[model samples]
Target: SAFDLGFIRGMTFGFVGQHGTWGTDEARASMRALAEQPFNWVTLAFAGLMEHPGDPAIAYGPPVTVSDDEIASMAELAHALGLKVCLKPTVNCRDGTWRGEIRFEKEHGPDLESWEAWFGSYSDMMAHYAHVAKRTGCEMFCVGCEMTTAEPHEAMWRETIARVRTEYDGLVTYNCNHGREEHVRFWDAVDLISSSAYYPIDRWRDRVPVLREVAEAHEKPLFFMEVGCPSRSGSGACPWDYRHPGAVCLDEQARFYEAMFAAMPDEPWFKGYMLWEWPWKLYPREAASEDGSYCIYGKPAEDVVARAFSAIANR
Candidate 1:
């Protein structure tokens, strides 16, 4: 069967809704503003918090995660506005550790935290959102996001995808960390291969071929689930690290956007990006020059994205 991996002229939105802005007027306006950019899809990404890297339990629900009602309503709004929804439920450490570093030494060790306990809890979390995705009519569901430490357990990930599949039947994906596509052995279980595309602005041509090869190897479609640079000096060199100290430079961000889209080769399986990101709340349009977050709203990169997304849609 020929699987249709539609081109995703997409943007990511509402990551880790810490302040519960999900169903509010600000979020509604934010989605409206994003759609006006002419992006046809949005990744509604939210996170479940783990206390630390070793912790097996993931804390989700109100106060920490956006509620299912909020997500469902947002999906409703997205469809009404002619936007396809990709529900991405991610995990992060409460202590500021990266999720990819979440690991444990003793697999079947003592009473301490172990892989079994972790995946058992995590599998349930994935199933929870899978049901939500089904209920809300989300077109896609991301099974995991950048969890490298957890990736080595092929059986566990396969189990997780199976669990997610039991609840939702739409397209399923795993958002791998940048450049680690070949490291993930379970891409065959997913419908698409995705990663955070955070290469140095100058290195896109070199990196794209490597990832595309992985997709070709797996015979699956490929896309950058997350990609972008902060509108700041030096951000083009370190697109993934927003903390890189530098002054705001809207022009630099625009250039990064320009180069990124220009570098993407016109291959059928190389689907587009879910840019990282649009926010729950936007700054005043007049003050965009002063902001330096990855959000492209009101920056020169916004127009760059609009033009790029328009061109991709036309293609």
Candidate 2:
């Protein structure tokens, strides 16, 4: 079956280390817990300074040496517990400024010369990640994440995907952050239409109809690549107001997952869902404020996800 072979009923868990974090032990523990759950797949983000390719002096800085042995060990451990791993690297356009060596200053930044230079840098990073994906046993890979300002370059992205396919033979997906459903035209080269779906809907009242509409429209298997709701105190009454008034309580996080599962549709095209993250600092960053605390095991959300998966599988 697709689910057993790591195609369907997939669940992704993220570790928040943009430049690298000191939470390997914590991440490992979280992975162990996820392996035991009904989730059949997992993913980790290699963001921040570690993702920069060599020449550490660039503004985005140099790539940290993430050993093949380290990745292999993680893959081995995941396989032992019945999980497939994917690598997701992200590029950021911050406050009208693009970080990293590759800047999109001309296309997206304040000037034209910088834009051209940054474009080249961005393409180089994509190619580098493709090489990394091939070296590792990664079954799936995400080329980019939420860089709306830089997504207009069809030619560059095409070349990037082509280069990645040359090295890695696994499935490829381009995560469009909060706007996956809108860019079908840009990602025609990919095998699957993956996106981060976090639209607001009342699960008890609107999940089936909304998902059905989405499935019918896509006519291809769809994966909720990312989704979550906030659990912070003093956050607001509406789901859209996902803010960090306080720490996201475990129980509130669990409720959010519960609603998500209840809102999903039971169709073959509805592949699976991957929660936004597992463990992180739970604090805001300079780039953006952390909104929804989207975890399964770190809080009460684990039980919610487990129960939903159990119910879905039995059905």
Candidate 3:
């Protein structure tokens, strides 16, 4: 019971700035907005990153590492606000490639080493945060986020989960890239099944049955670990593409969220969702002027988020 998402109402909190967020004015403002929206859960993502995807080592220190102390403080603040916390350890590449490309050749090169090296870095990154999650009383700890290429390392993935369990006694799950949930063979290792719900707006009818079938087969509840669309033109077709053309279509973003709630709420195994990319440094509601990014703050999509999340799905 401690390690499960029977139901959830969460938003992914992505902070901006060099300073930590514990007592910042903006962070308190952000928390106030979250309370106004009345989210029951918060997903705090700590990045494990490298210079490039090819690099086996995940670099730490300023800008990249969200230290355990910062996270523990945020967890306490969220708990005080009546919010559940999901601690997430995610890897990214500085060369602008998404984390799904974090991979290396099986055959070693002068530069390219074995997958073991990368997994070694990953194991340490997640293991550190899992302990933080346990210490801070998090509802869950997500092991990885959308590392598609790295998912093939089954034995190492199993070992990774085992290592996290030693530190984090809470629930564990991995965030698979959308449409790739069935591809992840080790879903049985984690307590809950998860995926990024970034599919095209047109494809929900086709995709829902597939997600439902996978969750039923695995005998685990399903939740969208990450899902958001930018307020730009043509983003609804492929919500995952962050670099889509800069066309300020706030209503388009709102409509996409409407479609998501209308489609997802009734699915039996579909438990909950955490809308991606809410910033800790919030902008004024009046400051929103043709913003063409995924930050949902003060956008028209914000109202839809409030309405959608207000509907108690899987409760």
In model 3, how large is the Cα lDDT of residue 222?
91
Q: CA lDDT of each candidate?
A: 0.88, 0.56, 0.79
Give the C-alpha miss distance for residue 134 in model 2, angstroms: 2.4
Q: How does residue 105 of candidate 1 score in lDDT?
A: 65
- For model 1, the stretches where C-alpha displacement exceeds 4 angstroms are 109-111
- Candidate 3 lowest-lDDT run of ten: 14-23
Error of 1 at 272 (Å): 0.9
How well does candidate 1 score on lDDT at residue 53?
Answer: 93
Candidate 2 lDDT over 283-309, as tens digits, reads 323312233454444445656767777
Off by over 4 Å in 3: 2-6, 15-23, 61-63, 107-112, 313-315
Please give, for residues 1-315, the per-residue lDDT of candidate 3 as tens digits.
Answer: 423445677788854322365447677678667766747888887565677877887875355565566776778888898888888877767787888886676623334566887778778888887888988999889998888887888999999999999998887888999978999999999988999999778887778888988988998889888888988888999899888966788887887887887777465577788878777777777876557777777888887877766657424
Scored by TM-score, the top model is 1
Rank order by TM-score, top first? 1, 3, 2
lDDT by residue for model 1 (271-297), tens: 888899988887789989899999998
Residue range with the least summed lDDT across 10 consecutive positions in model 2: 50-59
